[model samples]
Target chain A: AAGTIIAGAELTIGLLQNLLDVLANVNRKCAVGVDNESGFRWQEGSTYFFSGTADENLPYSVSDGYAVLYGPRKTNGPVATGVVGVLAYYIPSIGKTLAVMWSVPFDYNFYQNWWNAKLYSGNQDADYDHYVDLYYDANPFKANGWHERSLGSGLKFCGSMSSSGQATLEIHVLKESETCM
Target chain B: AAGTIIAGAELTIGLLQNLLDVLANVNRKCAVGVDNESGFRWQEGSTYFFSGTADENLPYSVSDGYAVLYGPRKTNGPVATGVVGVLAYYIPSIGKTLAVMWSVPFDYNFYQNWWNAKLYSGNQDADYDHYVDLYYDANPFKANGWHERSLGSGLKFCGSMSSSGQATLEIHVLKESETCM
Candidate 1:
């Protein structure tokens, strides 16, 4: 009777699971989008948005975030093109946005890419000159798995775009909580 | 104070989460393997095996099971070859095993495959003629997602093999409990 359930404990287990899943602040919902599309885009003009929350509200703290971008296959030809994937968040204590971007030369091989993280104080669209790079990788090729990042705040913006962009992006965010590790 | 945690309740959330994750009987552990490999293979002679449980034991009841096979891509020429993937389990009540097998004519497109489930009462290796087909699909092409199945008992055996089979296999099992849906 090691795994046997008590007669009246069925409901107890179900209720406890639901409560724990919420307090853990797990990413039960996700955002799926294509590059530069209005309805599914994570960024608009100067404002970026967070996904996977109940009301799409920003989290007070974030434990981690992950993004996966599937580049378009070489159906056209072997010609290489540039693709950019970005993940950004706002930190209230620092009054600045931390952003990471990957620049991939997507071609027939589909394995060449690079990434860098930075802090920016101005609009990302117009103030690229003010961004200070904090982390850089010239040969980061993790196409088979998720590109993971530790975070201090909610993921506010994420998108992928390419020269002949038809890539897909998926994002998940885990909020900082007692049950989240 | 909508989402505020009360004093002395941080430990409550962590303990409840751990308890629920177990009562749910979810597939917290997974098995990963390559084709025909000894240490990670899921099959051996007449005996098949189950994975993901605490002691690698079979569940008394199974809610569902899933398997994912990533076929080797066309690193060589575009020549077509045959590949097979199987998911099999024993039913104690019926004294027989229910098995599903997929025959894939894998080629450059990597989008062609077929599957069939059957009931067999004999050794699978030498008694292939005694198996009865129950479900069949010739144009099944869900290469991007998991191949899911409703199981009555625990998953016992699974593997992938091909002419040039270097395909990777991953399996997950969900035991039948009140919290498992």
Candidate 2:
């Protein structure tokens, strides 16, 4: 009772078998590594969507191996700065967790400044209206805007907040395999 | 320019509008609480595997809201205890972030007690092997192994490890509404 964790205590053969099956599923899907190709839609103003739909015939439920895409959604109100997008991966070679985040600046001073500037500036809404068409022609996959950093192991847990669109945390796991075969 | 958070340095119409849309998505998906009607098979052993496959037609990418499940992997060698799964959620009423985890018992004293007692007593895998059938018609859902508690909201990131088959960290989020209605 005084243990650090409390979870579904019972274990059954059915559950055990399911675990084996899920592992097989993960292995089958992600074994190939980053070269695996997939399709997704990245609408700048909208959220990112990985291509696929739930198929019961698949190996495991909530497949983490497929597609691997995520993004913030669209809305009718003012943008919410509280929303953040986080992607975390484990690199065993270096024994480290690398975390990258797309978040709303939450520091006390910075947030207030940003918020007030929006309120006081008369061009608040209109200025951004044309902002979308700025011809950025950016390579979405360049990994530039990502706030990257090293998060040590012994990871307890990590999550985002409401203002950051509450984007689902995308996870990646890397291993050492020099073979593409 | 005083604000709650200081991030990104600049906020424009494009980013603002994007934020609004992103919020809309998160709200739409999380609006309905618990009873979302999803499926998952939990297999228990040295590793736990949750069953489900990817479904793209879903409202958002990486559906952490759906049936949440995760676990470690099996190998020809001894089990790895570094696997951990996390579920984080924001309770608006309390204005807080709560996190729960599922992990293998790797602590010093307890683990030694668990392992050696099973080893020297000539009760190796058979103890657990037969221990499995102990009918123990137990409550499978009862919290016994989960490290569930308040893991403060300032999240940086999270990751998992492994020696042979150590897998990635899986995450999920939840909300309050009673059902799919």
Candidate 3:
């Protein structure tokens, strides 16, 4: 039983550290590129900003790697949306990649709307014409949904809004060559 | 000093072993299916019910891109809830991909509510109306929010719950056989 208990603790502890590494590295990785020292910035809006492989130990060079969209963490203006872990993956089918915009803060309605609005208009560049592809319910304020076009075609979208409104958006992106599967 | 001590290595080695295996094989990743091995499962009354990949080896598969979703250590029953890791990606333009369904253990209420209930209902498949789509919050439970027509759509969903009723959901999907960017 002790072994089992200890084993369980071991796994969780390690997993937690792994997660910690990913978070901590985000800065070191982010510094590799933007040199901003901080991991993310909302002013950049939703554009390909940082470049760093979550698993790769190497440094993350500051280049247009992936798009990062964030909100106030604690209703705090400058900070914007809770602690969010913007995780990424490279989908082979589409050749491009996708990301999870995890909003780790209080969940609610306005905030949910805030996120939708961002995706809908964050693309200040492209006239926001097809910022988000017409997919899923694609509601203006659904907690979980998908968004593509703004970034490209592969960016699928989904979201989760807690009772309090703390929410997270799961956005995927596809390179121009790929089609919506 | 003991209490003031930073719980780094003290908590890492054990955890490292647990997550090490999961992080090792990016090539042997698992697929999105009814996978009975130990992936995910939920019960109406809520006891523990379902398992998979949480305990296997050989890395998670390679080729293509995109990170996989996973759960924390131990396969106990009842509570059916713990830490969940969501993997993601970022493709420019469309910038999209599936995401992780994380159940933050003690974050807050709405979030707690969001995650637990999803896991419980995610299996509405057994009742099968929504086996994949057209089920549970399938409407009557929309209060919890979000649901895509299963199978037909790439959006997939799963969840977990604590004895306290806290919950979270994991919903994502794959593209049709395609290429990587």
Candidate 4:
């Protein structure tokens, strides 16, 4: 009964199975941050699955496995600028770190708040400048509420920044048990 | 190993169990739409879990179960306005249709693309006019890329509208089997 309508619409079991396979290949974790400059924290219930923040600079350091890093601030005169955060996960087979970086520009004038988010890959010990951008937003503009971007490998980046400067970022990993609701 | 870091951060099993309880009470499903005008379709692998498009008018009709309804167009002379889509679920225990609606304005000029999204509830057969607003965005502004919002009951509404009027909408239902990742 749960999937009755979906099944009736010709959505085959094979398709669902394919989706499950896709989910199986996904490797990611969840993390949240209150602002751009402060370090990111592991989800309250997922601390053990993640390594703690190791440094506070460009290519911010972390442990040997899944972790988060905050990039150096890109400032303009007196303003500190926007968010430049990353979700980094080391893959043993590939011997590289998959980094998903999101940058939401903070403008004192709300109308000037345009932003960009990108995904990159590089050596585990590399700095932010060493990574190569794989995907990125072409046009950036003001996002008023919570926004989310799918950074391959079943990782979802979500966040919201207010005109008053409050920011919140969250990452969600997609699982096989989840449904598109 | 799966939850080692989380466990180390003082995130106890009790907290994880409480999260599972919270997830258990969530009721939602996934639906995707290519644009705002044409009717929304059930996810390719989930047709049976959703009803087909009922009508093309406001307070769009559907069977007595989980479904999606697109609201009427709010036009401005030459151009079609924006997105007014709804995710409706009939809960037998409560005898009401829980409706979550998202609106992303389509401004031909790109710069004028401010928008709003909200949730509502009312009788099963009532039109869009009868539902009452619940949670909503306080400030509406131009969202250039994909954005997501969490409506209660583990439902996440995601969408994006381009300057040229192309739009995509998706809804995901959260599951207990999934962690913060």
- Interface DockQ of candidate 1: 0.01
For model 4, residues A1-181, the per-residue Cα lDDT tens digits are: 4244333433454465466455433322212332221122222110010111211212123322243433222321122334343444343333334444434444445533233343345343223442224213244324366665554544334454333323333333322233312
Top-DockQ candidate index: 3
Instruction: Compose the digit string of candidate 1's lDDT tens values, residues B1-181.
Output: 4233342244457567665644443211112221211112223222121211112333223322323333222212223333443445454444555554444343424643334444466335413332223323222322222233434443222222111122223333333231111
List the candidates ranked by lDDT, beginning with the highest. Answer: 4, 1, 3, 2
Question: Model 3 off-target regions past 4 Å?
Answer: A1-62, A67-71, A76-114, A117-141, A145-166, A179-181, B1-181
Q: List the residue pairs that clash in candidate 1.
A: B49-B156
Instruction: Give TM per candidate.
Output: 0.30, 0.20, 0.25, 0.28
Output the better candidate (2/3) by TM-score. 3
How would you encode candidate 4's per-residue C-alpha lDDT over B42-158 as one tens digit per residue?
221111111113224332333222434332333322333343434444433333344444344443235322333433443443234322232133443132333445545433344
Interface RMSD, model 4, angstroms: 23.6
Write candidate 1's Cα lDDT for A1-181 as tens digits.
Answer: 3122332244575687676555443212122221211112122112111111011112112322323232212211122333343444444444555554444343436644343344466334312232223223222323343444444443222323222223333333332232222
The fraction of reference interface contacts (C-alpha pairs within 8 A across chains A and B) present in each candidate is: 0.00, 0.00, 0.00, 0.00
Which candidate order results from sorting by TM-score in descending order?
1, 4, 3, 2
- The TM-score, computed over Cα atoms with residue i paired to residue i, of candidate 4 is 0.28
What does the interface RMSD come to for each candidate?
23.6, 23.1, 16.8, 23.6
Candidate 2's displacement at residue B42, Å, is 22
**DockQ score for candidate 3:** 0.04
* CA displacement after TM-score superposition, residue B138 of candidate 3 (Å): 14
lDDT of 2 by residue, B134-153 (tens): 21221111212221111233
What does candidate 2 score in Cα RMSD to the true structure? Answer: 27.2
